[PDB]
Design a protein around this ligand. Structure first.
Ligand SMILES: Cc1c(-c2ccc(N3CCc4cccc(C(=O)Nc5nc6ccccc6s5)c4C3)nc2C(=O)O)cnn1C[C@]12C[C@H]3C[C@H](C[C@H](C3)C1)C2
Length: 143
C-alpha cells in the first residue's frame, strides 16, 4: 500500500533530521499514524533499545548488499512472532541503517533502504497489521 510507503519515508526523514541530515519528508490521511510512530520510535530508542542485541552489527550495507541479506537480519526481530513493539523496533532499525549510510558517505543507499523497508513491510507486515486492528489500533493503544 502507498500509505505504508508514506510511513517509511516519513519516519526515515524524521530520523535523518534528528541527526542533522537533509531529507525529503507530516500531513494526509496517515498524519496521526506518522505522529504515533515518530513518538514510539523516540521512546523505543531512549528506554527500550539498549535491552536488545544491536542488529546493525549483523548487517553492513554496501552497494553490493542484496535485499535478502536485509530480510534475513530483520527476521531476527520477528522470531517470537509479530507485535507492535517489534514493528517499532523495525522502523527504528531502518532509521539507524540510513543514519550509518550517510555517516559512511553512502547517502545513495538511503533510497534503497527505504524501498527495502517498504518491501518487507508490505510482504511480511501488511497482513499481520490488517488482522490485528490496523494502524488505527496502534494509534489508540499508544495514545
Ligand atoms: C520494547 C517492546 C517490545 C519489543 C521490541 C523488540 C523486541 N525484540 C525482538 C527480539 C530481538 C532480537 C534481536 C534484536 C532485537 C532488536 O530490536 N535489536 C535492535 N537493534 C537496533 C539497532 C539500531 C536501531 C534499532 C534497533 S532494534 C530484538 C527486538 N521484542 C519486544 C518484545 O518485548 O516482544 C514490545 N513491546 N515493547 C514496548 C513498547 C513500549 C512503548 C514504546 C515502544 C512501542 C510500544 C509502546 C511498545 C515499545
Amino acid at each position: 500500500s502507498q500509505s505504508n510507503r508514506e510511513l517509511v519515508v516519513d519516519f526515515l526523514s524524521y530520523k535523518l533530521s534528528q541527526k542533522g541530515y537533509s531529507a525529503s519528508g507530516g500531513g494526509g490521511g496517515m498524519a496521526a499514524v506518522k505522529q504515533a510512530l515518530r513518538e514510539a520510535g523516540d521512546e523505543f530508542e531512549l528506554r527500550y533499545r539498549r535491552a536488545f542485541s544491536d542488529l546493525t552489527s549483523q548487517l553492513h550495507i554496501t552497494p553490493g548488499t542484496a535485499y535478502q541479506s536485509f530480510e534475513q537480519v530483520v527476521n531476527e526481530l520477528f522470531r517470537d512472532g509479530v507485535n507492535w513493539g517489534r514493528i517499532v523496533a523495525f522502523f527504528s532499525f531502518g532509521g539507524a541503517l540510513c543514519v550509518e549510510s550517510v555517516d559512511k558517505k553512502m547517502q545513495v543507499l538511503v533510497s534503497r533502504i527505504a524501498a527495502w523497508m517498504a518491501t518487507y513491510l508490505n510482504d511480511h507486515l501488511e497482513p499481520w497489521i490488517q488482522e490485528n486492528g490496523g494502524w488505527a489500533t496502534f494509534v489508540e493503544l499508544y495514545g
